[PDB]
Design a protein around this motif. Structure first.
Motif, PDB file in Angstrom:
ATOM      1  N   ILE A 174      29.643 -39.592   0.986  1.00 37.04           N
ATOM      2  CA  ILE A 174      28.537 -39.522   1.968  1.00 37.04           C
ATOM      3  C   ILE A 174      27.660 -38.394   1.662  1.00 37.04           C
ATOM      4  N   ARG A 175      28.175 -37.173   1.556  1.00 41.01           N
ATOM      5  CA  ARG A 175      27.370 -36.056   1.194  1.00 41.01           C
ATOM      6  C   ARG A 175      26.664 -36.041  -0.099  1.00 41.01           C
ATOM      7  N   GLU A 232      25.810 -38.556  -2.017  1.00 41.54           N
ATOM      8  CA  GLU A 232      24.728 -39.480  -2.114  1.00 41.54           C
ATOM      9  C   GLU A 232      23.461 -38.852  -1.560  1.00 41.54           C
ATOM     10  N   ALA A 233      23.562 -38.077  -0.477  1.00 44.58           N
ATOM     11  CA  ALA A 233      22.509 -37.432   0.240  1.00 44.58           C
ATOM     12  C   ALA A 233      21.977 -36.336  -0.600  1.00 44.58           C
ATOM     13  N   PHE A 282      30.692 -48.163   3.073  1.00 41.99           N
ATOM     14  CA  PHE A 282      29.410 -47.719   2.469  1.00 41.99           C
ATOM     15  C   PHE A 282      28.587 -48.951   2.074  1.00 41.99           C
ATOM     16  N   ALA A 289      29.747 -36.377   9.219  1.00 43.75           N
ATOM     17  CA  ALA A 289      29.243 -36.267   7.832  1.00 43.75           C
ATOM     18  C   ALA A 289      27.922 -36.915   7.638  1.00 43.75           C
ATOM     19  N   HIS A 312      24.033 -45.036   5.824  1.00 39.15           N
ATOM     20  CA  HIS A 312      25.220 -44.787   4.972  1.00 39.15           C
ATOM     21  C   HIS A 312      26.402 -45.703   5.252  1.00 39.15           C
ATOM     22  N   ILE A 366      19.972 -33.473   5.495  1.00 31.06           N
ATOM     23  CA  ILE A 366      19.673 -33.017   4.092  1.00 31.06           C
ATOM     24  C   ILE A 366      18.668 -33.789   3.382  1.00 31.06           C
ATOM     25  N   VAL A 367      18.737 -35.123   3.601  1.00 30.78           N
ATOM     26  CA  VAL A 367      17.734 -36.030   3.062  1.00 30.78           C
ATOM     27  C   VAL A 367      16.340 -35.777   3.753  1.00 30.78           C
ATOM     28  N   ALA A 404      24.569 -35.520   6.378  1.00 26.10           N
ATOM     29  CA  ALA A 404      24.002 -36.051   5.196  1.00 26.10           C
ATOM     30  C   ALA A 404      22.475 -36.417   5.318  1.00 26.10           C
TER      31      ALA A 404
END
Lengths: 224, 56, 52
Positions: free
Chosen positions: C17-18, C20-21, A71, B12, A22, B19-20, B16
């Motif tokens: 960030i979230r 996208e996940a 990002f 985060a 990310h 979750i993936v 994140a």
């Protein structure tokens, strides 16, 4: 100087983030004038630019080197936006293998030059002596064979090495010519002095393979 | 403020990425599920043909 | 840069960030629904043809 340089010895886990995918880090090579200009602009270059990342990790005379985190998708927008401002991006990510290999290149290059230099200084000195013993072996041979060609018999000769003190060579050479010259020619003889080396002419090179000026008796001049 | 911004975001990022990771887990189980719930229809179908054969 | 701008960027970044996940995870588990069905019908159809 930044133009090909990517840093790899000033890494840190937070000034250089990449652990998932990310977040990534782009480094920006910024001229000194432009340093304020970057601190102001960094956020606006693309959307999703991490806050307060803009700090000079390294600094040189011509340039100040910044880190900014952002990002991954946004890295394309960031770089193009950076080039309009008239900065120059330097792309380096914090992949583990990258950091390690550049560091390695510095080290491997110092170790190659180092080992080599020690063997090389040693090898020449060892070569120097051998080629010295060999140079004199030919001259001794050369002089001997020549003596046989010019005087004939006896094959038993009276042979010396005379050490001349520097810059008395010309005076020494002349005296020998007067005394001994009659033996190898009573008409093939002229006065001469010193040693002059040339590619203007082939005369005056004292050799038996190219035409030179005939010496009245065998004498070879060694310059060290 | 450098290690304040990085930190909020690193927390985060690990949430994140997890979750993936959950979705791939789900996706691997569904592919196993396919074979399990297909295997259960085939062996019921088999004795059904056999039943109408043994009558025959 | 100035403290108001750094908190403004901080809320915006972790939103992405979230999101996208979550988006990615949603395509991933959706496909999983499709693969289960196709492959489950294929496994049945193939062997019910052998049994016939």
């Amino acid at each position: 100087d930044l133009s090909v340089r990517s840093l790899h010895d000033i890494v840190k886990p937070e000034d250089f983030v990449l652990n998932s995918e990310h977040l990534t880090t782009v480094l920006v090579a910024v001229p000194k004038s432009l340093k304020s200009d970057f601190e102001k602009s960094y956020e606006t270059l693309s959307k999703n630019v991490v806050p307060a990342s803009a700090s000079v990790i390294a600094e040189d005379a011509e340039y100040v080197l910044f880190n900014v985190h952002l990002f991954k998708k946004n890295v394309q927008e960031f770089t193009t936006a950076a080039r309009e401002k008239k900065f120059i991006p330097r792309e380096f990510n914090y992949s583990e293998e990258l950091i390690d290999q550049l560091k390695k290149e510095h080290d491997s290059a110092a170790s190659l030059e180092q080992s080599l230099r020690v063997q090389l200084v040693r090898l020449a000195k060892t070569a120097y002596v051998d080629v010295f013993i060999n140079w004199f072996h030919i001259k001794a041979l050369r002089v001997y064979v020549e003596s046989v060609l010019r005087y004939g018999l006896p094959p038993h000769f009276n042979i010396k090495i005379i050490a001349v003190p520097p810059k008395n060579l010309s005076k020494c050479k002349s005296e020998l010519i007067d005394a001994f010259g009659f033996l190898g020619g009573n008409a093939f003889m002229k006065d001469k002095k010193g040693k002059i080396n040339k590619q203007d002419t082939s005369l005056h090179q004292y050799a038996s393979l190219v035409d030179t000026e005939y010496e009245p008796f065998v004498m070879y001049i060694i310059n060290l | 403020s450098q290690k304040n911004g990085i930190a909020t975001l690193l927390q985060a990022e690990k949430e994140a990425h997890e979750i993936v990771s959950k979705a791939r887990k789900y996706r691997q189980d569904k592919l196993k599920q396919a074979k399990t719930d297909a295997a259960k229809e085939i062996d019921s179908y088999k004795i059904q043909k056999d039943k109408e054969l043994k009558e025959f | 840069l100035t403290p108001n701008q750094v908190n403004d960027e901080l809320n915006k970044m972790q939103a992405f960030i979230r999101k996208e996940a979550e988006e990615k995870a949603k395509e991933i588990q959706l496909k999983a629904d499709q693969e289960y069905e196709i492959e489950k019908t294929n496994i049945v159809r193939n062997e019910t043809n052998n049994i016939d």
